[PDB]
């Protein structure tokens, strides 16, 4: 019942290969709904989920104007951060930003977020109080002073507690058939002999939404955390996700192993065994 909205910005310089590219993507939980790419033939905010299409021309124009302004602002920021770190004009650098709001199962604002990174390292982040900043170093301290003078934290707090929550609730309503529908994993256990004395037990979870899931293997009721090969949760390409957990078991000992599945879409958690 918990929901979140996030925007992910990536600004990447490419000296000798034109101006920095700016891409913005918007998500509601694990569903992308908008994109903007400064490298597109005609850069404009584009729908990426059917429930956002009903938004009028003023919505699309408002989004496009914000992201076009961001493209220019981020190009200046890349120049500034190059300077703050005494970097040469030769290297390619990346600024990333992720911000948004989290709602509880009551629809109330749980917390707001606004974090920025430089070359994949934390740079500056809005604290949970939505009033103060955490600057990673002396370079980020310059950004902090600039952001305090512009009153950014106060503007962000108004957005995070206001428009962010308001728009997220609107999207949750407009896309309730998908966004508020939890698809349970379809589960099974496969058996793969690895040798005469050992076999792999692989516990599968397919077609689930949202991505959050827990897949564990237990031997005689005790967690096999160190022995479990756990793949990263992966997108199926149709909104759903996939994951598997594997254990190498001594041949003949298969019934001492149980796979445990926890997901929001399930009426009750699952306990599965290999079924020969």
């Amino acid at each position: 019942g918990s929901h979140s909205m996030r925007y992910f910005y990536t600004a990447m310089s490419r000296p000798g290969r034109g101006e920095p590219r700016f891409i913005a993507v918007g998500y509601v939980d694990d569903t992308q709904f908008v994109r903007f790419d400064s490298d597109a033939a005609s850069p404009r905010t584009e729908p990426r989920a059917p429930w956002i299409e009903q938004e009028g021309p003023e919505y699309w124009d408002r989004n496009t104007q914000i992201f076009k302004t961001n493209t220019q602002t981020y190009r200046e920021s890349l120049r500034n951060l190059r300077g703050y770190y005494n970097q040469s004009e030769a290297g390619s650098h990346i600024i990333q930003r992720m911000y948004g709001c989290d709602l509880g199962p009551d629809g109330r604002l749980l917390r707001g977020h606004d974090q920025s990174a430089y070359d994949g390292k934390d740079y500056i982040a809005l604290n949970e109080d939505l009033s103060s900043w955490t600057a990673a170093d002396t370079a980020a301290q310059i950004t902090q002073r600039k952001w305090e003078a512009a009153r950014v934290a106060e503007q962000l707090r108004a957005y995070l507690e206001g428009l962010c929550v308001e728009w997220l609730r609107r999207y949750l309503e407009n896309g309730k058939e998908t966004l508020q529908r939890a698809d349970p994993p379809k589960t099974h256990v496969t058996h793969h002999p690895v040798s005469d004395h050992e076999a792999t037990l692989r516990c599968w979870a397919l077609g689930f939404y949202p991505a959050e899931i827990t897949l564990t293997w237990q031997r005689d009721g005790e967690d096999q955390t160190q022995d479990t090969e756990l793949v990263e949760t992966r997108p199926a390409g149709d909104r759903t996700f996939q994951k598997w957990a594997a254990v190498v078991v001594p041949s003949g000992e298969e019934q001492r192993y149980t796979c445990h599945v926890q997901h929001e879409g399930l009426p009750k958690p699952l306990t599965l065994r290999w079924e020969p």
């Binding site: 989004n63 961001n70 950004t143 503007q155």
Partner: peptide, 9 residues
């Protein structure tokens, strides 16, 4: 809807 204020770093 995204945040509408763009502030240079």
């Amino acid at each position: 809807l995204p945040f509408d204020k763009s502030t240079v770093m």
